[PDB]
Amino acid sequence: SMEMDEKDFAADSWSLAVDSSFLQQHKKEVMKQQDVIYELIQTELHHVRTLKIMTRLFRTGMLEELHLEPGVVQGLFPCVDELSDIHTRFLSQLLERRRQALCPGSTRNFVIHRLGDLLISQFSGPSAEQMCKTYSEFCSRHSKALKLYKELYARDKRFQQFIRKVTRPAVLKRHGVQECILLVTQRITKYPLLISRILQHSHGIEEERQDLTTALGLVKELLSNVDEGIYQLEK
């Protein structure tokens, strides 16, 4: 992740990220909505950062430092480039909506009034089909990736040494190989939770309550499709 974005999302909430005198100019219901919108973007940033750890640090690191066949690395990190592309584009649209909303003379103070349109685009048409096919694929290869990892770690000293080495920093404590794979599988089931809590505080502008209700239904349809398309593969 990039320093500019890490600072913008370092605070525990929108009410703490913005200047105190800016928060004071808003109604409580707005602060409540903004806190949940801020959480959705903040977790998408961590989600993309997890995928970059899997691609640059774990996946590329193995190719540039070990004599593992590329088929083995593909089994360990299934659909990671494709997942990285989907969520990095989604994060880019979310981060741009926040920047467009900033006040002049400020890099912290903003209010995002429209989110449903962006959430409908992501979870509908070709973009939703690409996520449904990539997540049905990822989640079917999920167990085989854990067993391949456990097998390689408990049989290869060079792999054990590599893993102990790259995961040594404190910032990668909850981000080992198996933890990254589970963080990714669990991501899609977080969206209905976040979108429903944002929706709960978006009844002031009727065009937005409907856009968010539509987005909520689109995500549930996507999850139901990913869930139906799953069938556990084995090594």
Partner: protein, 179 residues
């Protein structure tokens, strides 16, 4: 510093997300309680043994019977949660969660945790339940369920007041160590 995995299971409003957040932050979320929990690795020293305890939540997975089991691989302790202000979430413990947790996680210790115990003294909670011909879950009802499902133990806590929270995670660590 041995590494162990914890998974919390239970119905949607059983308070499992709040419990993990309150344990992993400790300093109470006075300004904003987050909607979701990603994961956390807690450093716990119980009975003079040091453990790295990975914490996972199954919130959002309750309706997806094929996605949910992907949370279970290599789990060492299961926190089976129910809400004390919801007698119906307790009746779903033997019928829904136990046959599933024992299928994917055989021999893995299960600790039955009654969340939201503060709501026993809440007059509004008692009033709402009384309207539905009901009462808040009694301690002996929790112990009887934990006995019937073959649980390793029964514990109660309150994410709101932080009461009982440290003891649940210290005991879960002890259960995860047994082999």
């Amino acid at each position: 510093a041995i590494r162990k995995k914890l998974v919390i299971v239970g119905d949607g409003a059983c308070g499992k997300t709040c419990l993990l957040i309150v344990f992993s932050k400790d300093q109470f979320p006075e300004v904003y309680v987050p909607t979701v929990f990603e994961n956390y690795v807690a450093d716990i020293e119980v009975d003079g043994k040091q453990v790295e305890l990975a914490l996972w939540d199954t919130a959002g997975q309750e309706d997806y019977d094929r996605l949910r089991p992907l949370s279970y691989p290599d789990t060492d302790v299961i926190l089976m949660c129910f809400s004390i202000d919801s007698p119906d979430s307790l009746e779903n413990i033997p019928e829904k969660w136990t046959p599933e947790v024992k299928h994917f996680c055989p021999n893995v210790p299960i600790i039955l945790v009654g969340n939201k115990k503060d709501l026993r003294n809440d007059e509004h909670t008692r009033r709402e339940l009384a309207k539905m011909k009901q009462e808040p879950v009694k301690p002996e009802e929790g112990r009887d369920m934990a006995n019937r499902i073959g649980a390793f133990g029964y514990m109660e806590c309150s994410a709101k007041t932080k009461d009982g929270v440290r003891e649940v995670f210290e005991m879960a660590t002890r259960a995860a160590l047994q082999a």
